[PDB]
Amino acid sequence: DVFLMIRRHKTTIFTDAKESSTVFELKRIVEGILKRPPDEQRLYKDDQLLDDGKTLGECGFTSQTARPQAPATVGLAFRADDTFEALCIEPFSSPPELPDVM
């Protein structure tokens, strides 16, 4: 099994899958939460793009890299009005500087 964060702008989804799970199957559950069609979904692996037929293991996602305590990030973009959006994942807030006592 694999654990991933499906990120899209300021939207992050925590869910679990398997190395054998295919990209299209992941788009199925994305519709289960975001209620959007797989036709208008574009998954990414570090701005590499993912094919609907390939598996997570083939895309580089592995159980040792997709942990419950450290899920693997997957890009997402949606096709609005028959035009796919460009990858835009909002970065999380940066932590503050480390106090001298650390």
Partner: protein
């Protein structure tokens, strides 16, 4: 059944209700619909809390070897304050 947790900087985290109810504080807040807004918890901290919920539910009552839960030094204090407020 999913629940959305929203941080102070606007980031939205959608997690299973089971995982969210790990926190006693969130359970009382949950009972908008299936939405909770945290005013003091930034995104980089709330993201790590959701990882704990996934880690907690995963390895609780399991015979699989339990790995260490990682906490970077930068986010240690903020996670502690969020954890103390969330009771998780």
């Amino acid at each position: 059944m999913y629940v959305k947790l929203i941080s102070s900087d606007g980031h939205e985290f959608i997690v299973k209700r089971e995982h969210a109810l790990t926190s006693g504080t969130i359970k009382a807040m949950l009972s908008e619909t299936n939405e909770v807004n945290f005013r003091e918890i930034p995104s980089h901290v709330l993201s790590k809390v959701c990882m704990y919920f996934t880690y907690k539910v995963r390895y609780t009552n399991s015979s699989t070897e339990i790995p260490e839960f990682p906490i970077a030094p930068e986010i240690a204090l903020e996670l502690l304050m969020a954890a103390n407020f969330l009771d998780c």
